[PDB]
């Protein structure tokens, strides 16, 4: 169970992940979204750890952590990160690597490597960006190894090559509290728009799930408990096939609390696309739009705790995730339902774009947020 310090940092991380999601959703080069709040927050913690003056103060400001001592930020986020990789009680597959790539000519300060390793498990390697073919190979191979092949290549190009690249590579596979049957899979169309359909594999289960149909805002919301019920995957989907902009305007922490309070445990037939969704985001511009203006600026950044010198700036914040929808989960008894309870289920038929998030059941704090707009398929 998280300390009160870590719980406060989880809340800061959740508030930031929400603001970032909304910023990225307004960008029409952004299709699928996959974001881990503690990992986004750790990018800001690293900037605070490696920066001075306004470079670092902006990082804490974007995290709404102005009234936390610097050491409290790094400690609380570190406990969070270590908790997500604990695997003691969770039974949920989570692989995370964090690596700071610096130019070959820039020596990381011994104090910063120890601290970033201690708090953020951050790895460090100088790479020479003159040799681009090899630079991409270092990054992509490191990410593939971090995720055991689930994320085989994070990026095809590095645009700004004169600064630091922060790369986070992740694999996340929610493990259901009540598993889907491995044979309840078939092939159906996913409607990206009303004129473009992609053939997908869908997985299906009928069970008792917390559920709410908002007829007035034409959306459904369903709660899927993960293994041992210490977090839940929440799915939000409009009635019609439509851009998610309208739903995203409604989505807030407050509105979610209203929705969840209206939920009732009912028989629901859930149909979801099955498979791996891979997304790489460069958060650089979006963090800057949220207030991290100087760290990302070749001419302003003060990251001299990272390197001793002051020409280093944050060129990229790569946030790369493989999120796998699969049937596996905990087994469940004969029948905790009866012949009666599962008849005439509501359908939650996710054959068109939806928003999803993972919430901590205890503190209601966000633990993952994304949307599926265009699945992979042949």
């Amino acid at each position: 169970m998280l300390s009160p310090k870590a719980a406060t940092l989880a809340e800061r991380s959740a508030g930031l992940a929400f603001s970032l999601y909304q910023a990225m959703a307004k960008d029409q080069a952004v299709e699928n979204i996959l974001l881990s709040p503690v990992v986004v927050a750790s990018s800001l913690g690293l900037v605070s750890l490696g920066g001075k003056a306004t470079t670092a103060s902006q990082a804490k400001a974007v995290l709404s952590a102005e009234q936390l001592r610097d050491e409290e930020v790094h400690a609380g986020l570190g406990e969070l990160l270590r908790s997500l990789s604990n695997s003691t009680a969770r039974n949920v597959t989570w692989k995370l690597g964090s690596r700071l790539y610096g130019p070959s000519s820039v020596s990381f300060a011994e104090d910063f490597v120890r601290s970033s390793k201690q708090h953020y498990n951050c790895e460090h390697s100088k790479i020479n960006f003159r040799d681009k073919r090899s630079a991409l190979q270092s990054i992509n191979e490191w990410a593939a190894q971090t995720t055991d092949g689930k994320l085989p290549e994070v990026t095809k190009d590095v645009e700004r090559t004169d600064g630091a690249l922060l790369v986070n590579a992740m694999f996340f596979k929610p493990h259901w509290d009540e598993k889907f049957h491995h044979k309840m899979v078939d092939n159906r169309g996913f409607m990206v728009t009303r004129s473009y359909t992609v053939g997908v594999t869908m997985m299906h289960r009928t069970g008792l799930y917390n559920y709410y149909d908002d007829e007035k805002e034409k959306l459904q919301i369903v709660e899927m408990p993960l293994a041992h019920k210490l977090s839940s995957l929440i799915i939000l989907m409009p009635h019609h096939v439509e851009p998610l902009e309208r739903l995203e305007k409604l989505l807030t922490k407050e509105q979610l609390k209203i929705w969840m309070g209206k939920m009732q445990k009912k028989a629901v037939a859930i149909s979801l696309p099955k498979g791996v969704v891979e997304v790489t985001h460069d958060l650089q511009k979006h963090l800057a739009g949220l207030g991290l203006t100087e760290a990302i600026d070749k001419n302003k950044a003060d990251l001299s705790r990272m390197s001793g010198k002051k020409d280093l700036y944050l060129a990229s914040v790569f946030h790369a995730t493989a999120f796998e929808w699969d049937t596996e989960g905990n087994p469940f008894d004969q029948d905790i339902y009866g012949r009666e309870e599962l008849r005439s289920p509501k359908l939650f038929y996710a054959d068109h774009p939806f928003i999803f998030l993972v919430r901590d059941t205890q503190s209601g704090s966000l633990l993952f947020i994304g949307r599926l707009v265009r699945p992979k398929g042949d």
């Binding site: 049957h181 309840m184 078939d186 149909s271 029948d335 038929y349």
Partner: peptide
């Protein structure tokens, strides 16, 4: 014990266009 209930049938055909 009996198996779980089967998956839903496929989504129905799309509706016709409206009048001009």
């Amino acid at each position: 014990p009996p198996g779980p209930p089967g998956p839903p049938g496929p989504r129905g055909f799309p509706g016709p266009p409206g009048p001009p």
